[PDB]
A paper describes a structure:
The fungal Bromodomain and Extra‐Terminal (BET) protein Bdf1 is a potential antifungal target against invasive fungal infections. We show that Bdf1 is essential in C. glabrata, and that inactivation of both Bdf1 BDs induces lethality.
We used a peptide array comprising histone sequences with diverse post‐translational modifications to probe the ligand selectivity of C. glabrata Bdf1 (CgBdf1) BD1 and BD2 (CgBD1 and CgBD2). Like other BET BDs, the two CgBDs displayed weak binding to mono‐acetylated peptides, enhanced binding to di‐ and tri‐acetylated peptides, and strongest binding to a tetra‐acetylated H4 peptide (H4ac4; acetylated on K5, K8, K12 and K16). Substituting a conserved tyrosine implicated in acetyllysine recognition by a phenylalanine (“Y/F” mutations Y166F and Y343F) abolished the interaction with acetylated peptides on the array and in pull‐down assays, demonstrating binding specificity. However, a major obstacle to the development of antifungal BET inhibitors is the requirement for a fungal‐selective dual BD inhibitor (a compound that inhibits both Bdf1 BDs with selectivity over human BET BDs). This challenge arises because the ligand binding pockets of Bdf1 BD1 and BD2 are more divergent than those of their orthologous human BET BDs. Structural modeling predicts that CgBD1 would also engage I‐BET151 less intimately than Brd4 BD1, since CgBD1 residues Arg150 and Gln154 point away from the ligand, unlike the corresponding inward‐pointing Trp81 and Gln85 residues of Brd4.
Author numbering: 124 to 237
Write the structure that this text describes.
């Protein structure tokens, strides 16, 4: 329909995800957490709603976000999941905070809808 964010906003967010993916600090966040391959079997006992950068990109490409703020909601979910599972001051979480700060700066430059 016409309820997903329009192309200019979609493309700006896709650019921001591309940019974040060039940060080496994004490496833990590039793909969904696989608790078997990573041997962290309790992951889904703590994490109800997993999120990662590829999933955000896929949702952008599927025109599934209704507002730019919903993209930020998913990004914050991704990093808060790490804070809960790995810990607020764990290396992975702090790498998440670093990419989150960069993402926020790009999201401040989102073009207006109209």
């Amino acid at each position: 329909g016409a309820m997903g964010i329009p192309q200019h906003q979609q493309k700006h967010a896709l650019m921001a995800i591309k940019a974040v993916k060039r940060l080496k600090d994004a490496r833990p966040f590039l793909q969904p957490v696989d608790p078997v391959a990573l041997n962290i079997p309790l992951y889904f006992n703590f994490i109800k709603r997993p999120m990662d950068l590829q999933t955000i990109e896929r949702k952008l490409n599927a025109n599934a976000y209704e507002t730019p703020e919903q993209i930020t909601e998913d990004f914050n979910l991704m990093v808060e999941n790490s804070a809960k599972f790995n810990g607020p001051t764990a290396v992975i979480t702090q790498m998440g905070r670093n990419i989150q700060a960069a993402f926020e700066k790009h999201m401040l430059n989102m073009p207006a809808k109209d």
